[PDB]
Write a protein that binds this ligand. Structure first.
Ligand SMILES: CC(C)(C)C(=O)OCC(C)(C)[C@@H](O)C(=O)NCCC(=O)NCCS
Ligand SMILES: CC(C)(C)C(=O)OCC(C)(C)[C@@H](O)C(=O)NCCC(=O)NCCS
Lengths: 389, 389, 389, 389
């Protein structure tokens, strides 16, 4: 019924690296223009831009509208941002699907975008500080990475999964290195070229073309993984080596009906058969993909074994192993081109990020059925089942 | 097909007034609890909570999810935030409608919440300020009230509609006083009692029940309206009197299928017959309701005359007159209980705010057909058509 | 040898009260102008202005220079600021004396000034805050009121003196009340009128003449002294009642040689017979006056019993009691017009503030010999012996 | 009568260079320790530490005291800071000379210190910012570099002198280049080794001994001087090239009577024969040294031509050329080892900085008579005359 006619994403930049001073919407407009060009669709035909974003503070009125306009999307179309944390970028696509499936839109550019580098430090100063020190809060850590309920970092929820699923430090590091090695492999071999649209960083003493994911470590060893001290719990198991990073990027897909893509002579990246969002305990938020993937697979009518390829978001090696262990799919078809540990985790763009990687591999190796899924902070999961035409 | 079984909202509080230190998500949870109680539905049955919010900076991971949890909605359900500026609150309800219509949920608590008082000041300070003065930005003005393209306050876009539609200073003031007078009459008569749910402001030396809209001025004269200097263009026409304020509040609805509401013995507030969202030039953003209501009316198969009641969001007196003048509906059925000039304009909650007034008046006077609509910053407009059962 | 030909001071203002927005150097100039007028000396004749100030941050290059210039003191003269914390106001005068004593100056204006109200909040942001919350620090508490070594507030030092000298809560409160009552009586009787020079608070909707010390409480009860909880040690004895306050003010003296006064027909307020400064352990910094006063007396050739009036600064009741107890002078001739608990403690001015009160009482009651002394943070004291001609 | 028994100064570090994160009081303690060590005098015997500092904001109660204590100077001794801008560091020595000459002290450690790197940004936020943006002020620019009266940077004052004394862009550059080259030669030859005491920068992944002035440029060309744009007046003549810099450092000298040195077996660096400070128009503040040196030479009984070495601080090439031009001393005996354009300008330390270089070259070449002088912001100068025993 509803298809992804085309897709694209920026390289994922490191924290204060390639896109340190690059606002989220500028990344988004580049990806909106890209999906338009790749599908052979004019921006004048786009009805609505839906972009997941978690940290828009200080970027001004509705960055989704700013991205759209700069992308040459007309003023008659509509745009908006949404926040389901890590799940946003993929949910935007599902929400984009719903627009078309209910007859409220024909063509929808959806996905997500995030500049964790440009998230500001903030403080409430309307009441006035008569006396005493006050905190300037990092919006990134407050609004993106710390649980609202139990007050600790997402890495502490990773510890709760690691201890519950008795996943050792050695098992988490081996998965970590495996992610880095696969991701260097898929990089050298050009397997990220299709999906990645170059982004021109507008400078002063020189522009810079970024078309390579700069967070991927090259020649990552097990020895350098085992020496790092625990990043959250000081007698724990999760580290900066086996957790995801702080990153900037954007990613999007162009949605339309299966009839509309056929009219236009477009051969789509895939057909969205079903999606699903489900909740879990915020203490073990890393177990989100388990019920959400299972819900999606139930809507699609598929069993776990029918999947040819899977993109399960690596938020932490503890939670990425747990999802894999519970669902029991073949690990050789999971994150075939590495995952978020190596590639990075631009919160709002992360779901649209892993949708690209899934769609292009499905096209490249001839996979029929595929699934994407991310764990979501606050204790939820989102999933989406794709079938190729 | 899809119905609002029940609804509720907090009193709209002034800037740094009744809810000066009350985070949005607390206001949201009360409204969730209210809509659950008023329908006779347990929090356990709620599949998702979709909350429009514009200024969540500093409030922590996904305030929609915080609102839900504190409301007693279980961990299995889902929750997310979205931003289409003023139109966020009403677009939550259409998006919540879409979930049910597409068979992805059975019950949805949609609406919006806003704490403008708690919107922090910010600045991006990762790079370091090697030397010189910097600016601490007001995330309320920047992210909520300033246009991202031309750089000015929304009041200057109200000046562009005033000069284009040649609406004099005297016409706008008259409309400003009429909104205040209508809203005081509805307040004294208890017409806001149904929709408003009391909110307990948790104090230290005494709690405070807020169940009255404290921004409504009592005994508003034309003379105090005509003495205020222009707020934006110093030789212009728009003022603090004829413009909307900065306000806190929350508003929500409980959505389910028409058959489900019949199963549960619930007599709904109304049936959502259509909606629509459209774009226009950001310079004349106030005109958003003109094409958006026209589209909505076209999707419902209705003519403008068929409407028995209308809520057109008074962002400014210049734009409120323009929409009424273009569409040409009988002005005696528009904002009958007053509007945003008098009541307030909590950005994210405003679309859910005006929905509640429409629904409870439609029920109280026996209006069959009704329409709600808001103008959106960045240059857009949303509209929803409601028919009672 | 050297005499104080004239002196003046502003009413001491409350924290964020009369002088809330009045920069320190404006108060300093008013007082500079005053001592010139009161001695019959033209600003043209002034060689240098020396002003103790502790919290000048954000006021600009060298507030002392700004003070002098606005007083009409000519550009050919020189001016500077100095910081020895609480001692700074009185040490300036001893420093002024030394300029004249060594032939480097004929006419010196010396004293101090302080706007604790206008002390700003600060933070070091040049390196950049890559990630995580940071503190905006209160320069008033950081640079004025916290010990640099042991890291606690001056009130905790006050507790160290309380316990070492076994001074009860009851003893501190009575003293606190005795200061307030003496101070109110001296106010009502007009005894502050000679020393105070009115200050014109330049407003916008009306100027305001401040010439009554506003922090002096009227009708202070022992019962309201007994009920306050301890401000520093939550099981301690020092409170906001028995400690000094946070205040604004300036004060200054006009120095020249005894021969020079006689040439001009001036009858001086006093002859500066000696001064001293001495150090003690910072834990017990309130004990500064004990060895300082003793030293000054030894340099003067005077015994303690030869003094007719004393102004021993009340930073805290605990230390104030200790100094009296150790030195053993007649308490009926100490802070006869009340003290800093009642009057205020504008850190940098405080030493000139107490000189004024000493000098004008000595003239009024015909005391021949007098002594002024303040305890200093970081463990120091300063004393100065005055004799009348 | 009074002599300098010993002296010492840190390397002067670049803005956010070697001491980027080193509080001024750590630099002042190393220099206190040094001057004690170098005279054969124990901290125990030090009566007082007097340190000029202009930007102590955020460092805590009285850095002078903190420096002294860290240096091992005992709690019985006393300590304070003063501010006369660029003059601060040298006036401390004159103020130290006065303590001994009037019998109030026997041994004084005096001089200055400054960490411009660590100067914080501040804002006055007690009243509450109700609404709108506010400025975070750079204390270094506001409180150290901008003129309080006319509101412009010190550099603009430099232009007034350039225009008044008709000093061309070419003449300023040649002077600028010549300071660099003379300073590189002295550096390479070890001529700064005597005066400099190494400073251990405590780190975490290593300590660092800084004992070389890092701001000195090597192989400076006239060409690169000519290409720079005017830093202040955009059609002006003064640049970053020919202006001094922003710098960190400390410097100190140890004073005692000539007899006291004779008793201790010490051979002093020099006798202080006179000093002076004088005022001029703030507009042309760079002319400060002219009347201050003239005054100084008069009190000494010396004509200008008697001087064998001179250290005339280089705040700006324009002013430096002015002072040399007006006073007419042999330019070959002035700043013989280079100056502030090359070495840097740690505002509060600078006057002691230049004392050191004067003192150690007078010893090394056998100059009998010498003179140091600095121009001072707000419109003043200071000068000190030194003779060798
Ligand atoms: C705001 C108000 C009324 C002052 C109050 O309640 O607080 C009391 C407070 C701030 C704890 C107390 O530290 C105080 O006012 N101290 C000033 C005394 C002080 O530190 N003096 C320096 C001389 S050594
Ligand atoms: C150091 C850096 C960042 C390269 C630079 O821009 O230096 C040039 C700068 C900052 C514009 C210029 O104002 C400067 O360095 N001035 C210091 C000279 C100065 O005013 N000293 C005070 C004595 S009157």
């Amino acid at each position: 019924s509803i298809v992804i006619a085309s897709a694209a994403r920026t390289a994922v930049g490191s924290f204060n690296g390639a896109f340190a001073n690059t606002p989220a919407h500028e990344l988004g407009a580049t990806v909106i223009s890209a999906v338009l060009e790749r599908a052979g669709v004019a921006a004048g035909e786009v009805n609505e831009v839906i972009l997941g974003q978690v940290l828009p503070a200080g970027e001004g009125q509705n960055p989704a509208r700013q991205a759209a306009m700069k992308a040459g999307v007309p003023q008659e179309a509509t745009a908006w941002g949404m926040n389901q944390l890590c799940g946003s970028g993929l949910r935007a696509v599902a929400l984009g699907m719903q627009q078309i499936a209910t007859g409220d839109a024909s063509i929808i550019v959806a996905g997500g975008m995030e500049s964790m580098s440009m998230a500001p430090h903030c403080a409430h100063l309307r009441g006035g500080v008569k006396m005493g020190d006050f905190k300037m809060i990092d919006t990134m850590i407050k609004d993106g990475l710390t649980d609202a309920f139990y007050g600790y970092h997402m890495g502490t929820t990773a510890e709760n999964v690691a201890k519950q699923w008795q996943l050792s430090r050695d098992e988490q590091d081996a998965f970590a290195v495996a992610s880095q090695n696969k991701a260097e492999a898929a990089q050298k071999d050009g397997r990220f070229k299709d999906e990645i649209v170059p982004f021109i960083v507008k400078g002063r003493k020189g522009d810079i073309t970024v078309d390579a994911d700069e967070y991927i470590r090259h020649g990552a060893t097990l020895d350098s993984m085992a020496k790092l001290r625990p990043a959250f719990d000081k007698e724990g198991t999760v580290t900066a080596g086996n957790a995801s990073g702080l990153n900037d990027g954007a990613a999007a897909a162009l949605l339309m009906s299966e009839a509309e893509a056929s009219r236009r002579g477009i051969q789509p990246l895939g057909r969205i058969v079903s999606w699903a969002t489900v909740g879990v305990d915020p203490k073990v938020m890393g177990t989100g993909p388990i019920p959400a993937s299972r819900k999606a697979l139930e809507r699609a009518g598929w069993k776990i074994g029918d999947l040819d390829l899977v993109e399960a978001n690596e938020a932490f090696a503890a939670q990425a192993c747990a999802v894999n262990k519970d669902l029991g799919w073949d690990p050789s078809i999971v994150n075939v081109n590495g995952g978020a540990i190596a590639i990075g985790h631009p919160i709002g763009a992360s779901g649209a990020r892993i949708l690209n990687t899934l769609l292009f591999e499905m096209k490249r190796r001839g996979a029929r059925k595929g699934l994407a899924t991310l764990c979501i902070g606050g204790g939820m999961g989102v999933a989406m089942c794709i079938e190729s035409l």
